[PDB]
Amino acid sequence: KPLPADKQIETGPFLEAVSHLPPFFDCLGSPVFTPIKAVISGNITKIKAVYDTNPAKFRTLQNILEVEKEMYGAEWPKVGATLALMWLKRGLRFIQVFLQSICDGERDENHPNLIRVNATKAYEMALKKYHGWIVQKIFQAALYAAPYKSDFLKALSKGQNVTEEECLEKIRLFLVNYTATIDVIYEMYTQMNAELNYKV
Amino acid sequence: KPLPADKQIETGPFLEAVSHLPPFFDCLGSPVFTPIKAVISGNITKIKAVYDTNPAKFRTLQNILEVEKEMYGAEWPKVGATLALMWLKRGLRFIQVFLQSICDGERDENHPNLIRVNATKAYEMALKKYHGWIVQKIFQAALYAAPYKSDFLKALSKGQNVTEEECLEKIRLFLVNYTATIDVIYEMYTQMNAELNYKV
Ligand SMILES: CCCCCCCCCCCCC/C=C/[C@@H](O)[C@H](CO[C@@H]1O[C@H](COS(=O)(=O)O)[C@H](O)[C@H](OS(=O)(=O)O)[C@H]1O)NC(=O)CCCCCCCCCCC
Ligand SMILES: CCCCCCCCCCCCC/C=C/[C@@H](O)[C@H](CO[C@@H]1O[C@H](COS(=O)(=O)O)[C@H](O)[C@H](OS(=O)(=O)O)[C@H]1O)NC(=O)CCCCCCCCCCC
């Protein structure tokens, strides 16, 4: 669903929507990805837990950051839903860049049936800055579990008898509001000065 | 708490107790371990979700396996709480072996302040059999994030001004009923023929 004119993101509908994402991690076809899935669900659960304390006070994602800034003083933004969403957005951003890169025909012509170059760009853009050396190594090792581009798209459809070309068009359509939403979240962190750069 | 004479493990108290374990993963002192924590909590949450449907029907862990065998026929044991507990026990077992190995003075004399040999034995005994080649590599990479033995024990106390010797005695005491409980769980899977050996 698109953004309102005021670009405020409603927390309830947002959480409803993003809870559809973790299951997709089996479109990757390896148990290597199950811990990532659990990790992302954890951020969603935390934001949900905060939201459920006072859906009115926490009606928008902006409100979450505002109220928590006040509630936590010097520990903010490394606290609460503000912290879980700071990490969730980076996961969302990684997915966005990865998909877009694939949709844009970016590839290694030496190895066109893979998705390493797309995941690597996605990692560099969304996460690398916030991760130390050992996590970068674990990411680099994790990539050997990544499905073939073929299989990945196939899985985003299913046995669903549809072309690669069709699947990519649907992904392209999807990316429009997905990207716009994530850009509003990143903009909100920037303007509230809530972004932390610690390397984990 | 010890086992009853009938060795039946009550589900409610078990879940209460094991929910204390995931937080310990920060005793390891690296965000490398956060996905593992989320993974283990996921198994606990799933068992809890099943238990909450009918605490009477699911009063013991044995009951879980029994009722699910019946409910799921040919998909059992790769289903439900039986599957989450099959994986939880392996995590519990890994922790047990790791601790015991440390308590038993097992070490690499070339590198005594580390815990690699203890984690490696723990991995070989609890998990290696169920994991493919890429996960074994990720485990092997993860170990470079492992704390020094010193720091690990220190963290199991805290600033808590207590000796290594003291901490290990408390761990030894802890391991008695911990181990006995886990042995009953493994025995139950064996006798119900509910163990799956698929390599993930
Ligand atoms: C045999 C078993 C061996 C397995 C051993 C380990 C396996 C490797 C696991 C490590 C992999 C690296 C991934 C690291 C992830 C997390 O450290 C980071 C930070 O996570 C946050 O840490 C936080 C603490 O922050 S800190 O105070 O700054 O430390 C919080 O705990 C926060 O929780 S919450 O309560 O706020 O909601 C939590 O998510 N998470 C991320 O990096 C996001 C990962 C998004 C993944 C995007 C998709 C990747 C796809 C990969 C496929 C190629
Ligand atoms: C930048 C971001 C990069 C990060 C990318 C990935 C990082 C690496 C993550 C992979 C690490 C390997 C660990 C793999 C764990 C899991 O695959 C396995 C199986 O997990 C189960 O899979 C299951 C599916 O089973 S299957 O049908 O057979 O596939 C279920 O999904 C089950 O969920 S539940 O719903 O049943 O409750 C789920 O736990 N889990 C384990 O191996 C247990 C791990 C215990 C860890 C013990 C402590 C390790 C400490 C390490 C420190 C040295």
From Swiss-Prot, chains A, B:
Sequence repeat residue numbers: 36-46, 47-57
Region (2 X 12 AA approximate tandem repeats) residue spans: 36-57
Tissues expressed in: Detected in fibroblasts (at protein level). Detected in fibroblasts and in various cancer cell lines.
Keyword vocabulary terms for this entry: Acetylation, Cytoplasm, Lipid transport, Repeat, Transport
Binding site for beta-D-galactosyl-(1->4)-beta-D-glucosyl-(1<->1)-N-[(9Z)-octadecenoyl]-sphing-4-enine: 39-46, 131, 198
GO biological process, one term: response to immobilization stress
Family: Belongs to the GLTP family.
Protein name: Glycolipid transfer protein
